[PDB]
Design a protein around this ligand. Structure first.
Ligand code: CLA
Ligand code: CLA
Ligand code: CLA
Ligand code: CLA
Ligand code: CLA
Ligand code: CLA
Ligand code: CLA
Ligand code: CLA
Ligand code: CLA
Ligand code: BCR
Ligand code: SF4
Lengths: 119, 27, 731, 31, 61, 80, 175
């Protein structure tokens, strides 16, 4: 709940009072000017981002991750840029030198606290 | 067929129970 | 270490209920903990071995104590045909009044011990309850010894070094000599000193076993090699087991065959038997080098067996490295060899019944066989399951550079294609012939059946003297080389047991033997198609070659690339456990319906009504469950009312398995959200909030728990039907 | 034959041992 | 190396390991996997056209 | 957390990022491909591990591999 | 060498109570850590002194009420006159207390190396129970040597059976 779990607060703006669909279920009123939406988990929120963005222009939208100590975060957008569009600011993490074909066998990782792909 | 040997039995497996908890609280 | 999985911090951070289940099911997975290296692994499995052994000897002291204290053991010794062997007594507060009249056997209300234990303790020479108490204390002491060692070798300076554990070289010098050779020799020191005289009437307890020699002259004029004196006067014919009438005094006579009266093997034959096995194992203990240096280096024994024919890769060079460093290879060979040993035990406990007045109670013999067959299949499936664990988490194809193992992974495609071929062939040629015989029998015509005589088994019984077929070969022909070659030694005492149709040795054979034994080979080849599949495709398939990276029991790969339900090496276990229960199913349905035709007497009831499937579902399941399912009526109950309850109970286990096997997680993972919504929202219970978050069971656990209910439901149903069926047609 | 001993041990291990052992194991989750 | 050449692969994790295929694209622009090759038969993703490097690229005649 | 690692088959066709419903994966300008793009997974703390990326990863065999690691609150995806 | 023997100068021992020397010809103290073997030596020597005084003191002819001995070996008459009384079971069982209760953690004190591995306390003596330097070592050598001669001398007290079948007093009445 709001006493111990992270509530995700999707904030966005529109132009017309349309009708979208909640990830809770059922239609919502969709305040035209600017509106927030407290949600439970992130897949609901970005599923609402796909719910709106694949319909029509809904941009300048992002969830503030309400965590129960009080402060916020900035999910989705992160960098005023759409994530599959390429911005030259995102520093890559999570790559290796080659394919799976050069991953070590787990009998070399055995009795060590490594992973089968680290090289 | 008697009763005293049953008491001796539960004494020996009570001690064996102390070795069971004794081995159990080290691994 | 912080919470629960005091061993894995990858699960102590989990807030769900998965920390409990995976905290349990990865507890013994010692190869994947926080920081447990090799010395900290062998020094834990070595202690837990001792804890295990002490659990075994606590259990056998349990049987010794309940038979010592609640059983009717010496009253059973008085009349081993008549009185039923009693198990431990009952304390139910639920047996109201009418149940207790269905269990009173004397003052006791005990269960009837359908586990063959009084027979083996009666051939050991236990003829009292006092020896059972001294033995039960004698194993409480031994379990305290083993718990002392496991506690003692986890004390820090007595934790043995890993170079001692890698004395792989010399365990075989000590197991084959000390564990196998000496103890079996020591077991002759029982059988010569206890079972022979207490079978020949002489109560040699713990007093006179040094003053009464088992032969009237012994060991001062017997280092001279006059060993035919120890096989001088056998127990010939006119003897009842236990008294001294009609019995000789020789010790190691190898007559061969059975008693005439108790239909069990001679204890002279077992004394000579374990003596010869003892000598041959002690000879086999002198096999390998040690600190002395007279033996065989194992590197020189696997390195030398590279054929110059060149077909078998670069030989076994690489195998000795991957047994020392491995464990699941060594455990795979251990469960393979123990499992074939169990199936050998099962195939000889009925065939050559060792224990006096077995094959006279027709329930304990029917439970020991089925017991060791289901344990046999469990340990084979363990050998292949740890085979796949060896090929994932333990296999190095750079130390196994083009080795015999890497050759196996090379031609694993041909292996799985040909296992699938023979399994397909037998599955269209058992099911084809049973549906042929069942259609044809169904159409008013049992004659137009396909019955193939299994001539190869009939010819092999002709090689062992069964003259009821008319082949007249090596032992059935009384004039051949082997027939003259042991004419005095062990043949005429043994061909009487072969040509007899009372005993369960070399049974008479119809085409039910043919069609069933093809069904069994179907079970073995399907089950090895699965196990050898997900043991050789355990590491990488053309669906996903990442499989070695994910460990053994990873769930899936998602819907990607067509869908990937059960790709892991754990699936081969998960499916060949169904085929294990099925195959051991057909083994024990076949054995049990063969012997419900022998023990009833109507062998024609089998051989006329087993070549088709309504012979099984009619003449065996529908008819022999009649004294089962009458276990309690609206007219009353009887002593079978436990088993007829358990039977029904076990169906409720079995089908609950289907709830986990058929219907998978994401149903329940979005149903627990309704339950947690309803618990959070309600008054008077939102105070009582969970700590571990309620989460449906993960899809490795779920398939596992559905498998566990499938096994428990299966095995409890069939343990209900063996015992209630034979105990309903008899006793 | 101390016939009274199952009337002691079968309840004190049958029911009250999987009460206090539930307490020992379940508090032992949080110790 | 060249376009249209029938090429067997030597990387053990492809679906088309030890199966010949036709080269569609060869790129000369420092790409680590420049050679886009498609095939007759099709893997599980419904996708014959993949790409490879030069070491895993054996032509025939 | 579910460790998502993105190998060098990643030709940057962005069906991973457009397929992931969690924005754990972005695109990074990487001058090693024809498109100059290669995906990255910085925010794997939010990674469910539903492997909807590996469905829509049109490489030879799976530039992006999702190894099932730890299970936190968010990675378990429970609503409450 | 340090040994008064052929040759092995101080393999691992040399300060132990060998007043005539450190014997150790065979490679046990090479690899057995020597504290284990010292606890085993002292425990065997105590129980063997009890054994030999048992055999001699029983061969001075004393019974509450039993059979004639004719031997203090050969299990049925002696030993399984005693076992069938239900009598040796407790005289084993109290030692089954003693070793597991006060010998096993005592042996844990023979694990760490903080014991001088004899030493179950136990000096109920005045004017001669020196725990210090002189009489502790030269009397511990007395327990050691009389225990070793108890080990072998109990060996002969067992093995005078084949040409004898009689008591050892009757062996003294024979040559
Ligand atoms: C493989 C080794 C082995 C095993 C498992 C057994 C097992 C057994 N022996 Mg035994 N025995 C052995 C070797 C062995 N013996 C040898 C080598 C000798 C010759 C010294 C004896 C001499 C012996 C006697 C004299 C008696 C037993 C008895 C027994 C039974 C109870 C023992 C007890 O209370 O504690 C038990 C089944 C007792 C028994 O069966 O009661 C009648 C009994 O009186 N044993
Ligand atoms: C002579 C010396 C000796 C002896 C007796 C043993 C004995 C044992 N060692 Mg061992 N060991 C030794 C020397 C010895 N070791 C040395 C020198 C080393 C160092 C190189 C080791 C290193 C070592 C390790 C590392 C381990 C052992 C283990 C074991 C135990 C095996 C488990 C068991 O009980 O199986 C008993 C098996 C049988 C009795 C036979 C099973 C198979 C037969 C063919 C079937 C049974 C026969 C018959 C048909 C059935 C009778 C049943 C009856 C109802 C009819 C066993 C107690 C293991 C253990 O559990 O730790 C305690 C273990 O992990 N040992
Ligand atoms: C390891 C088992 C074992 C043990 C401890 C003994 C121990 C003994 N046997 Mg023995 N014995 C054994 C196996 C064993 N035997 C076997 C297998 C046979 C058959 C070959 C014999 C045949 C045998 C004879 C014929 C005699 C002994 C005798 C003896 C006793 C004096 C020597 C001694 C108690 C002698 C004795 O007095 O019997 C008690 C004696 O005359 N034994
Ligand atoms: C002496 C034999 C032996 C030994 C040492 C091992 C040892 C091991 N096995 Mg194993 N295994 C064996 C035999 C053995 N196996 C056999 C015979 C089989 C075939 C049945 C298997 C099948 C098997 C599988 C499939 C897997 C292992 C795994 C493992 C490893 C971890 C086990 C663990 O943490 O479990 C923790 C302990 C438990 C889960 C408790 C067991 C409870 C089971 C699941 C159900 C029993 C409940 C019971 C029936 C309910 C009672 C109710 C009543 C009505 C009946 C460990 C090295 C695992 C592994 O290495 O993968 C990482 C793994 O996935 N084994
Ligand atoms: C009644 C239950 C049943 C049956 C018949 C089978 C049969 C088979 N399983 Mg199996 N299996 C079952 C339950 C069953 N399974 C369960 C519960 C599990 C656990 C999930 C498994 C797990 C399992 C695994 C893991 C594997 C098998 C495999 C096989 C095949 C083994 C090879 C063989 O015998 O081929 C002979 C073929 C048959 C016996 C098929 C029956 C013949 C049919 C009925 C005739 C053809 C159709 C007929 C003309 C009717 C027309 C229909 C009409 C609409 C026109 C065989 C098809 C293996 C395999 O693929 O082997 C190659 C394999 O690896 N099974
Ligand atoms: C490949 C499938 C297969 C498998 C696994 C088995 C397995 C078995 N059969 Mg067998 N059997 C098979 C096919 C098979 N059979 C066929 C096709 C026939 C002819 C109908 C028989 C006839 C047969 C008899 C008569 C007996 C057995 C028996 C047995 C059991 C003992 C082993 C033995 O005698 O080997 C037998 C091994 C073979 C016959 C070789 C089979 C391998 C080839 C590839 C099968 C195909 C051959 C092909 C159809 C012939 C070509 C035409 C040719 C006539 C010109 C064992 C379960 C015995 C039994 O039940 O005792 C328990 C027994 O008495 N079998
Ligand atoms: C994956 C399944 C799973 C698992 C392993 C657990 C495990 C746990 N839950 Mg849990 N839970 C689950 C699903 C699960 N839950 C679901 C789906 C819900 C609904 C949202 C809950 C709701 C829930 C609450 C509300 C609470 C727990 C709590 C707990 C913890 C204490 C055990 C307990 O209360 O149950 C024990 C079993 C029962 C209470 C069964 C109730 C019905 C019985 C049969 C009636 C009693 C009859 C009789 C008198 C019993 C006497 C014998 C007995 C004393 C031995 C334990 C860690 C408690 C906790 O975290 O406190 C620290 C707690 O307060 N759970
Ligand atoms: C494994 C151990 C075990 C034991 C020893 C018992 C014992 C008992 N059960 Mg029981 N039960 C068990 C498991 C067990 N159950 C399980 C697993 C289930 C679920 C299937 C049940 C379900 C069950 C039901 C549904 C009922 C019983 C009842 C009873 C009582 C029988 C009534 C009778 O004729 O006695 C004569 C009765 C008495 C002498 C009065 C005794 C009343 C209590 C038990 C004693 C006082 C308790 C005290 C205040 C608190 C002390 C601690 C306490 C936990 C013992 C008896 C005490 C019946 C019952 O409720 O009886 C009270 C009943 O209706 N049981
Ligand atoms: C339980 C049997 C046992 C055990 C464990 C030991 C153990 C030991 N003896 Mg020993 N000993 C024994 C029986 C035993 N003895 C017997 C029966 C005799 C009389 C022949 C001796 C006579 C003896 C002498 C004379 C000496 C040892 C010494 C030693 C110590 C080192 C040399 C060695 O390994 O030997 C070691 C503590 C030596 C020692 O303590 O060093 C001073 C030493 O000098 N022993
Ligand atoms: C996966 C794996 C594995 C597996 C496991 C197992 C399970 C195996 C199998 C195996 C088995 C399970 C076994 C079996 C064997 C076989 C046999 C052994 C057969 C043969 C037979 C015979 C030999 C017989 C004959 C005869 C007769 C009849 C009489 C006369 C004489 C004679 C003896 C010749 C291993 C560990 C290895 C490796 C790793 C991986
Ligand atoms: S892991 Fe599951 S969530 Fe994270 S990217 Fe791949 S698919 Fe989307």
């Amino acid at each position: 709940c709001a006493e111990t779990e992270e509530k995700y607060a999707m904030t966005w703006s529109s132009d017309q009072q349309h009708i979208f669909e909640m990830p809770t279920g059922g239609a919502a009123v969709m305040n035209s000017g600017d509106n927030l939406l407290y949600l439970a988990r992130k897949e609901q929120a970005l599923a609402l981002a796909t719910q709106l963005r694949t319909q029509f222009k809904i941009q300048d939208y992002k969830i503030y991750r309400i965590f129960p100590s009080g402060e916020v975060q900035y999910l989705h957008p992160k960098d005023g840029v759409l994530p599959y569009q390429v911005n030259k600011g995102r520093e890559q993490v999570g790559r290796v030198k080659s394919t799976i074909g050069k991953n070590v066998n787990p009998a070399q990782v055995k009795f060590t606290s490594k992973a089968t792909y680290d090289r | 067929i008697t009763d005293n040997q049953v008491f001796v039995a539960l004494i020996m497996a009570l001690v064996c129970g102390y070795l069971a908890v004794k081995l159990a609280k080290q691994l | 270490a912080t919470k629960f999985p005091k061993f894995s911090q990858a699960l102590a951070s989990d807030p769900t209920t998965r920390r409990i289940w995976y905290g349990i099911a990865t507890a013994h997975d010692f190869e994947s903990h926080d920081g447990m290296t090799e010395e900290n692994l062998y020094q834990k499995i070595f202690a837990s071995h001792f804890g295990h052994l002490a659990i075994i000897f606590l259990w056998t002291s349990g049987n010794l104590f309940h038979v010592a204290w609640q059983g009717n053991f010496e009253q059973w010794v008085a009349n081993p045909l008549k009185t039923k062997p009693l198990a431990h007594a009952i304390w139910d507060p639920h047996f109201g009044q009418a149940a207790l009249k269905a269990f009173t056997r004397g003052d006791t209300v005990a269960n009837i011990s359908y586990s063959g234990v009084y027979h083996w303790w009666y051939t050991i020479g236990i003829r009292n309850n006092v020896e059972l108490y001294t033995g039960a204390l004698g194993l409480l002491v031994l379990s305290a010894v083993f718990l002392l060692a496991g506690w003692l070798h986890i004390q820090p300076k007595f934790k043995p070094s890993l170079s001692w554990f890698k004395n792989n070289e010399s365990r075989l010098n000590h197991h084959l000599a000390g564990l196998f050779g000496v103890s079996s020799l020591a077991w002759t020191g029982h059988l010569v000193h206890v079972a022979i005289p207490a079978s020949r009437g002489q109560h040699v307890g713990w007093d006179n076993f040094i003053m009464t020699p088992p032969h009237p002259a012994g060991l001062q004029p017997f280092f001279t090699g006059n060993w035919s004196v120890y096989a001088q006067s056998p127990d010939s014919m006119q003897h009842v087991f236990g008294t001294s009438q009609g019995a000789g005094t020789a010790i190691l006579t190898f007559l061969g065959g059975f008693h005439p009266q108790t239909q069990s093997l001679w204890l002279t034959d077992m004394a000579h038997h374990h003596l010869a096995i003892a000598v041959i194992f002690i000879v086999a203990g002198h096999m390998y080098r040690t600190n002395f240096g007279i033996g065989h280096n194992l590197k020189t024994i696997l390195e030398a067996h590279r054929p110059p024919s060149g077909r078998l890769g670069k030989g076994h060079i690489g195998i000795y490295q991957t047994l020392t460093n491995s464990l699941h290879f060594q455990l795979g060979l251990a469960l393979a060899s123990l499992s074939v040993v169990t199936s050998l035990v099962a195939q000889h406990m009925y065939a050559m019944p060792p224990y006096a007045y077995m094959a006279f109670d027709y329930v304990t013999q029917s439970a020991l066989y089925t017991h060791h067959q289901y344990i046999a299949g469990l340990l084979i499936v363990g050998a292949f399951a740890h085979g796949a664990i060896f090929f994932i988490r333990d296999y190095d194809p750079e130390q196994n550079q083009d080795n015999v193992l890497a050759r196996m992974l090379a031609h694993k495609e041909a292996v799985i294609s040909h296992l699938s071929w023979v399994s397909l062939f037998l599955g269209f040629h058992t099911l084809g012939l049973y549906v042929h015989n069942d259609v044809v029998v169904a159409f008013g015509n049992p004659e137009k059946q396909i019955l193939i005589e299994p001539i190869f088994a009939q010819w092999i019984q002709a090689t062992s003297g069964k003259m009821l077929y008319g082949f007249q070969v090596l032992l059935s022909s009384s004039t051949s080389n082997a027939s003259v070659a042991a004419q005095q030694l062990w043949l005429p005492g043994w061909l009487e047991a072969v040509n007899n149709e009372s005993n369960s040795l070399f049974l008479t054979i119809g085409p039910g033997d043919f069609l069933v034994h093809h069904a069994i080979a179907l079970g073995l080849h399907t089950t090895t198609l699965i196990l050898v599949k997900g043991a050789l495709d355990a590491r990488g398939s053309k669906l996903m070659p990442d499989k070695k990276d994910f460990g053994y029991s990873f769930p899936c790969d998602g819907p990607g690339r067509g869908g990937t339900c059960d790709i892991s090496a754990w699936d081969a276990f998960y499916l060949a456990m169904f085929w294990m229960l099925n195959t051991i199913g057909w083994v024990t349905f076949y054995w049990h319906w063969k012997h419900l035709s022998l023990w009833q007497g109507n062998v024609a009831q089998f051989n006329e009504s087993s070549t088709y499937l309504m012979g099984w579902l009619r003449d065996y399941l529908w008819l022999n469950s009649s004294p089962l399912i009458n276990g309690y009526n609206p007219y009353g109950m009887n002593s079978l009312a436990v088993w007829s309850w358990m039977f029904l109970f076990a169906h409720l286990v079995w089908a609950t398995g289907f709830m986990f096997l058929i219907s998978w997680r994401g149903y329940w993972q979005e149903l627990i959200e309704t339950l947690a919504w309803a618990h959070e929202r309600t008054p008077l219970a939102n105070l009582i909030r969970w700590k571990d978050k309620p989460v449906a069971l993960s899809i490795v656990q779920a398939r596992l728990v559905g498998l566990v209910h499938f096994t428990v439901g299966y095995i409890l149903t069939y343990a209900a039907f063996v015992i209630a069926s034979t105990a309903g047609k008899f006793s | 034959s101390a016939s009274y001993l199952p009337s002691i041990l079968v309840p004190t291990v049958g029911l009250i041992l999987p009460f206090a052992s539930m307490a020992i194991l379940f508090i032992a989750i949080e110790k | 190396i060249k376009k249209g050449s029938l090429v067997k692969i030597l990387r053990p994790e492809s679906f088309w390991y030890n199966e010949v295929g036709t080269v569609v694209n060869v790129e000369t622009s420092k790409v680590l996997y420049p050679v886009l090759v498609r095939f007759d038969k099709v893997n599980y993703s419904g996708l014959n056209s993949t790409n490879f490097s030069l070491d895993e690229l054996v032509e025939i005649k | 957390a579910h460790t998502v690692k993105i190998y060098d088959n990643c030709i940057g066709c962005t069906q991973c990022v457009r397929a992931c419903p969690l924005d754990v994966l972005e695109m990074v300008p990487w001058d090693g491909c024809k498109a100059g793009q290669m995906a990255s997974a910085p925010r794997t703390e939010d990674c469910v591990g539903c492997k909807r990326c590996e469905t829509a990863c049109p490489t030879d065999f799976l530039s992006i591999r999702v190894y099932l690691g730890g299970e936190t609150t968010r990675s378990m995806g429970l609503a409450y | 060498p340090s040994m008064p023997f052929l040759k092995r100068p101080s393999k691992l021992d040399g300060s132990l109570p060998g007043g005539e020397g450190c014997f150790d010809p065979l490679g046990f103290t090479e690899v057995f850590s020597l504290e284990w073997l010292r606890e085993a030596e002292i425990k065997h020597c105590r129980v063997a002194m009890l054994a030999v005084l048992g055999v001699i003191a029983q061969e001075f002819g004393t019974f509450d009420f039993y059979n004639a001995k004719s031997k203090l070996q050969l299990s049925p008459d002696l030993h399984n006159q005693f076992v069938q009384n239900g009598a040796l079971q407790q005289i084993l069982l109290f030692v089954c207390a003693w070793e597991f209760i006060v010998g096993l953690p005592a042996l844990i004190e023979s694990v760490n190396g903080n014991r001088e591995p004899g030493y179950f306390g136990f000096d109920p003596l005045k004017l001669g129970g020196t725990v210090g330097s002189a009489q502790w070592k030269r009397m511990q050598a007395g327990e050691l040597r009389n225990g070793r001669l108890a080990m072998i001398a109990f060996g002969g007290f067992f093995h005078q059976q084949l040409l004898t079948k009689q008591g050892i007093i009757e062996q003294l009445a024979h040559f």
